[PDB]
C-alpha cells in the first residue's frame with residue numbers, strides 16, 4: 011500500500027475507529043486513526059483556511075485551521091519524517107463523502123519546501139501557488155472525482171448539475187512535480203502548505219472531510235476509500 | 248514539430264548558418280538562426296552566470312551573461328510569447344558538442360513564473376531553485392547524455408570521470424512540472440531564470456554551447472541535433 | 485530640492501501644464517510633466533490595481549493599471565535610474581486633492597528590490613508586503629494628511645468618519661528603510677511595486693490622483709504641493 | 722533597560738554566571754543566563770552558519786548552528802513572544818570580546834517575518850537579505866565598534882589595521898525598519914533568520930561570542946556590556 015502522512019479536517023465523527031465525538035482536525039501517520047486531534051468548529055458554507063508547517067529542527071508537524079473572526083483550532087505532533095516517508099514524495103489534497111455529504115471545494119493552495127545541504131550549505135527549494143484553478147490544469151494530477159475549472163476552483167468530490175454535493179465520492183489533486191522532502195545530508199529541511207476551503211452541506215451531518223497529504227510519488231486513491239477513509243487509506247487499521 | 252523559444256550561449260561560430268564570427272549570446276524564436284545576438288567574451292574554465300527575464304507588460308525577452316569582475320554581454324528582443332508558445336510548456340537547459348567540445352556543466356539553476364488573473368487579479372506562481380543536483384533528481388527529466396550527481400552538478404553533455412568533455416554529445420534537463428507561461432485572461436505574466444555554468448575545453452575552439460529553453464511539454468531532443476543545433480532544433484532553417 | 489521618479493494615476497486633467505484632456509497614467513522623471521502618458525479609464529468607486537516594474541537589463545520603467553474584468557492601461561519609458569536617482573532612496577505612495585476631490589485609499593502595497601553584485605555575483609534584496617495597515621504602522625513614515633487604521637486601510641488624503649473626501653489635501657507614506665536602488669558594481673538590479681487603490685468621488689470631476697514614487701531618503705512634501713502637484717513637486721516646471 | 726530576546730553563539734564559558742563548561746549556543750530571554758543551551762563545537766577560522774526560527778503555532782524558538790561536513794548543534798525553547806517582547810521591535814546582530822578576543826565577522830544575513838490577519842486572513846511580511854555589506858549601508862544601524870565595507874563584510878567588533886581582533890570591544894548592527902513581531906489579532910505569526918559568520922582568534926580560548934537578537938525599537942548597547950555580556954545586557958542577572 012501507499013505511505014501516507016496527512017493533516018485531516020474531519021467533519022464526521024466515526025467514533026468506532028478512534029474519532030472524538032465532534033468535528034476535529036488531526037495528524038495522520040500511516041493510519042486514518044489520528045495520532046493527535048483537536049476540536050474543530052467547522053462552519054457550514056463558510057470559507058476557511060488551513061495552514062500546515064514542519065521543520066527538521068524541531069521535527070514537529072503542526073496545523074492550524076480557522077475562519078475569519080473566529081478562534082482557530084491547532085494540532086501538533088512530533089514525528090521524524092525521515093523514518094516515515096520516502097526521500098521523494100508528491101503532495102496533494104484529498105476529500106471524500108459517504109452516506110452523508112458536503113462540497114469539498116478548494117479555493118486556493120500554496121506550498122513551499124526547502125532543503126539545505128550539509129556539505130555546502132546550499133539550498134534547494136520548491137514553491138507553487140494556486141489562487142485560481144483552470145479547466146485544464148496541467149501541473150496538477152487529478153484522481154477519482156476531482157475536477158477543476160468551475161468558478162476557478164478545485165472540487166475534490168462530485169457535485170451535481172444543480173450544485174448539490176454527492177455521496178460515496180472521493181477525489182484528490184497532487185502537484186505534478188515530485189518533492190524532495192528530506193535528505194540525510196541536509197542541515198535544515200522544512201515545508202509549509204496553506205489552502206482555503208469551502209465545505210457546505212444540506213443535511214445536518216456533513217461528511218466526510220478534506221486532507222492535505224504527502225505520499226509516495228506513485229500514490230493512487232485506494233479502492234473503496236470513500237467515507238471515513240478520506241481517499242487516503244485502504245482500511246481503518 | 249516542437250515549438251522552441253530559447254536563449255543561447257553559443258560558443259562556436261557557424262557562420263554558414265547565420266552566426267556572427269565570434270562567440271555570442273542570442274535569442275532564438277522557433278529557429279536556430281537567432282533573431283538577435285550580442286558578442287560574448289566567453290572565458291574558458293571560469294564559472295559564469297546567465298539571467299533571463301520576460302514580462303508581458305513590455306513583451307520583451309532579455310538576457311545577460313557575465314563573469315565576476317568583467318563586462319557583461321546583454322541581448323533583448325521584442326516578442327509576444329502568447330503568439331509563439333502554447334499556453335502550457337516545460338522549461339529546461341540544453342547543450343551540445345560536435346567535432347569540437349567543451350564541458351557543459353550547470354552548477355545552479357533557478358526559475359520563477361507568475362500569472363495574474365484578469366478577473367480576480369489573484370496570482371498563480373511557480374518557483375524552483377537547484378543549488379545542488381543529486382544522482383537521482385526526480386523533479387528533473389533528463390534527456391540524451393545529461394547526468395546529475397558528480398560534485399552535485401548537472402552535466403548536460405558527456406564528460407569522463409576526470410572531467411574531460413567528449414564530442415558528438417547532446418543532453419537536456421527539463422523541470423518536471425509543466426508551467427502555465429501565458430494566459431489570455433491574465434493582467435500580467437512574467438518569468439525569470441538564472442543558471443551558473445562552467446564551460447571548459449582543452450582545444451583552441453570550444454563548441455557548441457548551452458541554452459535555456461521553453462518548449463511544448465512533450466518536447467524531446469530532435470533526432471541528430473548534436474553540434475550547432477544545440478539539441479533544440481531539427482535543422483538549421 | 486528633492487529628486488523624484490514616479491508613476492502617476494492622474495485623475496484630473498490640467499492641460500495648462502501638459503496633461504492630456506482625460507484621466508491618464510504617466511511616468512514622471514523629475515517633473516510633474518510626464519515624460520510619457522497613456523489614457524486611463526478610471527472607474528470611480530471601484531478597487532483597482534497598479535503594477536510597476538523596472539530592471540537594469542532593459543533600463544525601462546513600465547506600469548500597468550487595471551480593474552477586474554476590464555482592459556488595462558500601460559505606459560513605459562526608457563530611463564537609466566543610476567543617472568537620475570541617488571544610490572540610496574526611499575519608496576512611497578502619494579496623493580492629493582484640490583478644488584475637486586476623491587478618496588485616495590490604499591488597500592494593499594508590496595515592493596521588492598534586488599541588487600546583484602558584479603564582483604561576487606551575490607544578491608542583496610528587500611521585500612515588504614502590506615495587505616492590512618495598522619493605526620500605528622511603525623515601518624511607515626506618514627507625511628501630511630496620510631493616516632492608517634480605518635478599516636485596515638491607508639488613507640493618503642483627508643476623509644471624514646463616513647468616508648467623504650476633502651479638498652486641498654495632500655499626504656504620503658514612505659517605507660521606513662532606505663532602499664539601495666542602484667549600484668555601479670551590480671550585474672543586474674531591479675524592482676517591482678504593486679498596490680490596490682480605491683478612488684471614489686461625489687462630484688462629477690474627481691481630483692487629483694495617486695502616485696508611486698522613489699525619492700532621496702530625506703524627501704518631504706514640497707510646500708503647497710496640493711492639487712495638480714500630487715505632493716511630489718514644488719512647481720509645474 | 723531594554724527588552725532582549727536572543728540566540729547566542731557563546732564561544733567563552735563563564736561558569737560563574739551559568740555557562741556550561743564549553744562553547745555553546747543558547748536561547749536568552751531577558752537575561753544573559755540562557756534558559757536553554759547546547760554544546761557547540763566552534764571551529765576557529767571556519768565559516769559557519771546559524772539558522773533561527775519561530776512560529777506562533779508552536780510558540781517555540783529554535784536555532785541550529787553548523788559548519789560544512791560536521792554535525793550541527795541545536796537548541797529549542799518554549800516561549801510566547803507575545804508576553805515577552807513589545808508589539809514592534811528591531812532585529813540585529815551583536816558581538817563582543819573581553820580579555821580574550823576573536824574576529825566577529827558576518828558574511829551574510831537574511832530575515833523574514835510574516836503576520837496573518839485573523840479577520841481577513843491577509844498577511845503582512847518583511848524580508849531582507851544581505852550577501853554583501855557596503856561601506857555606507859544605509860539600511861543598517863551600526864552601534865559601538867561595528868563597521869562594514871571591508872571585503873563586503875560586517876565586522877561586529879574592532880579589528881586592527883594588521884587584521885588582528887581587539888579585546889574589550891562591542892558592536893551591533895540592526896535592520897533600519899521596525900518589525901511587527903506579533904499581533905494579538907493575527908492567526909499566524911512567524912519569522913526566521915540566517916547568517917554566516919567567521920570567528921577567528923590567535924588565543925587558545927577565543928571570546929566572547931555573537932548573537933542574533935530582537936529588542937525594543939530604540940535599543941542601544943548597554944554601557945560596559947563587553948566580554949560575557951555580549952553587548953546585549955547591562956548585567957549578568
Ligand SMILES: CO[C@H]1O[C@H](CO[C@H]2O[C@H](CO)[C@@H](O)[C@H](O)[C@@H]2O)[C@@H](O)[C@H](O[C@H]2O[C@H](CO)[C@@H](O)[C@H](O)[C@@H]2O)[C@@H]1CCO
Pocket residue numbers: 022023024025026027107108109110111217218236237238239
Ligand atoms: C449504518 O450505520 C453505520 O454506517 C453509517 C453510514 O456510514 C457511511 O457514511 C459515513 C458518513 O458519510 C462514512 O463516514 C462511513 O465511512 C460510511 O461511508 C454511519 O453514519 C454510522 O455511524 C454512526 O454510528 C457509528 C456506530 O455507533 C458511530 O461510531 C459513528 O460515529 C456514527 O455515530 C455507522 C458507521 C459504522 O462504522
Ligand SMILES: CO[C@H]1O[C@H](CO[C@H]2O[C@H](CO)[C@@H](O)[C@H](O)[C@@H]2O)[C@@H](O)[C@H](O[C@H]2O[C@H](CO)[C@@H](O)[C@H](O)[C@@H]2O)[C@@H]1CCO
Pocket residue numbers: 259260261262263264344345346347348454455473474475476
Ligand atoms: C568540415 O567542416 C565543417 O564541419 C566542421 C565540423 O562540424 C561539426 O562540429 C562543429 C563544432 O563542434 C558543430 O558545430 C557542427 O554542427 C558539427 O557537429 C565545422 O567545424 C566546420 O565549420 C567551419 O567551417 C565553416 C565553413 O564550411 C564555417 O562556416 C564555420 O563557421 C567554421 O569556420 C564546417 C561546418 C559546415 O557546416
Ligand SMILES: CO[C@H]1O[C@H](CO[C@H]2O[C@H](CO)[C@@H](O)[C@H](O)[C@@H]2O)[C@@H](O)[C@H](O[C@H]2O[C@H](CO)[C@@H](O)[C@H](O)[C@@H]2O)[C@@H]1CCO
Pocket residue numbers: 496497498499500501581582583584585691692710711712713
Ligand atoms: C480657476 O481655474 C483654475 O483653477 C481650478 C482649480 O484648481 C485647483 O483644483 C484643481 C483640481 O483639484 C487642482 O488640480 C489645482 O492644482 C488646484 O488645486 C482648476 O480646476 C482649473 O483647471 C481647468 O482650467 C484650466 C485652464 O483652462 C485647464 O488647463 C484645466 O485642464 C482645467 O480645465 C484652473 C487651473 C489653472 O491652473
Ligand SMILES: CO[C@H]1O[C@H](CO[C@H]2O[C@H](CO)[C@@H](O)[C@H](O)[C@@H]2O)[C@@H](O)[C@H](O[C@H]2O[C@H](CO)[C@@H](O)[C@H](O)[C@@H]2O)[C@@H]1CCO
Pocket residue numbers: 733734735736737738818819820821822928929947948949950
Ligand atoms: C580574573 O579572572 C576573571 O576574569 C577573566 C577575564 O574576564 C574578562 O574576559 C572574559 C573573556 O573575554 C570575559 O568573558 C569577561 O566578561 C571579562 O571581560 C575571566 O577570563 C575569568 O574566567 C575564568 O574564571 C572564572 C572564575 O573561576 C570562571 O567562572 C570562568 O568560566 C573562567 O574559567 C574570570 C571571570 C570572573 O567572572
Ligand SMILES: [Ca+2]
Pocket residue numbers: 020021022023024029218238
Ligand atoms: Ca471521520
Ligand SMILES: [Ca+2]
Pocket residue numbers: 257258259260261266455475
Ligand atoms: Ca554556433
Ligand SMILES: [Ca+2]
Pocket residue numbers: 494495496497498503692712
Ligand atoms: Ca493632473
Ligand SMILES: [Ca+2]
Pocket residue numbers: 731732733734735740929949
Ligand atoms: Ca560566555
Ligand SMILES: [Mn+2]
Pocket residue numbers: 018020029030036042044
Ligand atoms: Mn478523524
Ligand SMILES: [Mn+2]
Pocket residue numbers: 255257266273279281
Ligand atoms: Mn548562434
Ligand SMILES: [Mn+2]
Pocket residue numbers: 492494503504510516518
Ligand atoms: Mn498628469
Ligand SMILES: [Mn+2]
Pocket residue numbers: 729731740741747753755
Ligand atoms: Mn552563555
